[model samples]
Target: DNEPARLRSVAENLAAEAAAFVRGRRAEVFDPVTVVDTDTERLLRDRLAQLRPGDPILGEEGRVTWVLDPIDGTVNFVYGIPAYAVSIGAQVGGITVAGAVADVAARTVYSAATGLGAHLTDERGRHVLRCTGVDELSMALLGTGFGYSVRCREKQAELLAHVVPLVRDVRRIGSAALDLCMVAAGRLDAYYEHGVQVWDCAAGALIAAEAGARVLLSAGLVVVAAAPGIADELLAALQRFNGLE
Candidate 1:
């Protein structure tokens, strides 16, 4: 697995690039959406160049890599909503083992190694991360995402309709990376959504798992991240809803 090298490079690059965008005139004179997306794409490409030439890469940036999304929550950043992030990940032989997510506003970094644990970096320095302690769905705080497309919106709405009333609360965050990082940090009990590309959740999923969250891949290929105690039941519910079981 390329976890170790990928994690280190991606994490450092995301942090540095995000910080530059935030501190530059982009954060004050221009809108973060434009500056962040532009800078993220360039920086991520530069970072990807550091990878082995044959390694498959993916991210929000429109590079030749298998995956990429330069900026998550573009509108939020532009409006100063404080929930945007930089998401990057890599896959080798169809398996994703390493990734990193940086919450631009908070400057929080989340990363994961395949067999090791997830980690969070902030002013307190790096520390092992963990998911929520809650077990039951009714007691869990769920996180979800909405897509810009109509079909995606309807599908997501259907899924939410089925699960919302069953959970303690549901949050719709614009940034998928941050949502996943929150799960890793125990701020969010679980997160599930469709229409997300590999770049958006790959690193976040690794982080969540490293943080002791049990991750479930559903029938629609949606990802569910939760503490181990509720993982089984959550997977069951996801299966029942999607007829995967």
Candidate 2:
């Protein structure tokens, strides 16, 4: 409601704390729901219980539903690829009012509040987030992700093959949250994926949108975040390839 900023603060703090917990647990070496993953979710749930008390939570793991992903890239985390994160989003009646994503290895936090804009906070300082100015899909660096199912991965692979020739290039970063945040940070011109759960992008999609990217959450869980300049072209291509299906 009138508390997007306050909600954002809560999301930021909780994400940071949970991320710290993840960082420690991973160093000890770690799940889709393994001990570390559950522990991280429990840590977040307990803290939210204290902070928001009674707020409903919905996660990859609630009503004022605090959507959380204790570890966005479980595979990467296990391999020490350094790209996982703790993502938290506060949704009121299904619309996210505030959210945050903390990059465990990068030691950075990305956050946004409805209508308040996106920001990146790290050792350097807090800086406003912005999408790249890339205007042409043929020159844009696109990011995407695949699902765990072989059928789903096959479908995405076909879609990717068709689109790769039309764009500058593509990257399959394991984490959807970071990919969306990368769009916000201008590190990626666009990111698209099919079948990612809300916990993966709830915070990240909002951050990307706030950074001036055109974020589209199509039917079938096709999420696309692109720079304003290439948003239209990207959508057109996806439509042509039936990527929206």
Candidate 3:
């Protein structure tokens, strides 16, 4: 409890810091934001190492340790697409108990601790995040992504072709973190993705769950977060197509 609180604090503060750093570096480079990834990751890692020296970290640069995703939408960030984000999740042994995501382009910070509901702060003010009450999967506005691997992409595309006709529609957002946050904010009715690493949804998945969505994980390294009302039906649909059943 106290630890979750503290962890939430660290995640929020450092995610914000990393987001700011990426924005600045990207502006200075004026080319592609992809180049800033390593530097930004190290900048964040250095702070984590200093503040939580005892914690083992599993980062892009190491293993068996803290979790960090410096830039969640590198391609989008590179093309000046404005959907990039900084995400950080802490797992004492398993997965997210506390995490934070800074939407660099949107200028919003979202965070939550276990048992604490999710929320986001923007220029408007601080507001609690919540999912839609839509009860039908067919009417749901679904979100998903493609992986870099050809095999994975092929399967994902097939799954989507089958799944799309069954939903209101689908969006292939470039950022998992923001897609989950969008579920939290009711901007999306549901989101599912394959091959998402811990750093990808550590914060954003918890954010969606805390906002009253259902979070599902698969052995194929997939994650699905949906509005509570439609979660089961949507997940069942996914399972039928994804071979999870």
Candidate 4:
């Protein structure tokens, strides 16, 4: 009974609920470590128990698994930078079947099910999503994110130094999930980040792919989401610098 569209609805609703909770709590608090992360996950678990009981889970918080990133871009959440999100995905046998990523501040949700196409829903209405048709890496707007560790950031910066000139520009929005979703929405032409957790991209990556972007998870957890036109050049550029898979 792995019905993707139905599962998509479940994921979308659960993520939206978690997003709403986080939005309300964020208004009253400043510390992301205070309660937002775990509490939001707890709310998701409570709902999953009623909605999809006994499914194994793999979360930033573990399989038929419900993948959850209760709050992505926590630093942004803490500083009110408005780039954070709640991500949820349903995976069967390690492949996602349906997923949703909710922009907590924007009141928007990006979602997709296998073969059903990607969608963006907000206050105005629901719309089909697509990555841009930009045909050249030199003209593409690329997105990337940095890890928290200094060592990780050092390597990422080094790589960026090489790749930055090849792209039209780079945007580091502090959230891997949102970066991928932005690709789906055509707000960014391509995105790649090193050392991302599954929960971070499980939903957004799928949404991007369903929107016709090429998504890749290379060795060392390097995740790339790009419009089909630039996917090859982006991959080649990254590989030229660091031999990324």
Reference-based lDDT, residue 80, model 3: 91
Candidate 4 segments whose C-alpha is farther than 4 A from its true place: none
- Order the candidate numbers by lDDT, best to worst: 2, 4, 3, 1
Model 3: per-residue Cα lDDT at residue 241: 73
Error in Å for residue 173 of model 2 = 1.2
**Runs in model 1 lying further than 4 Å from the true structure:** 1-10, 22-25, 28-35, 50-56, 61-67, 218-221, 243-245
Per-residue lDDT of 93 in model 4: 84
lDDT of each: 0.70, 0.88, 0.83, 0.88
Candidate 1 residue-wise lDDT, 1-245, digit = tens: 34466555655565557555654644565643666566667765665566444545544533123345666777776777878776666555655566677777787777776776777778999888878788788898888887444564775688678877788898987877788899999998888777666667777877888888987554125677887887777777777777222
Writing each residue's lDDT as its tens digit, candidate 4 over 195-215 gives: 888888888989999999999
* Model 2 residue 128 lDDT score: 99
Clashing residue pairs, backbone N/CA/C < 3 A, model 1: 58-67, 58-68, 59-67, 59-68, 59-69, 60-68, 60-69, 60-70, 61-70, 118-210
What TM-scores do the predictions have?
0.84, 0.95, 0.93, 0.96
Native-to-model Cα distance after best TM-score fit, residue 233 in candidate 4, in Å: 1.2
Query: Of the candidates numbered 3 and 4, which has the greater lDDT value?
Result: 4
Of the two candidates 1 and 4, the one with more favorable lDDT, higher being better, is: 4
Clashes of each: 10, 6, 5, 6
Candidate 4 TM-score to native = 0.96
Q: How does model 3 fare in lDDT?
A: 0.83
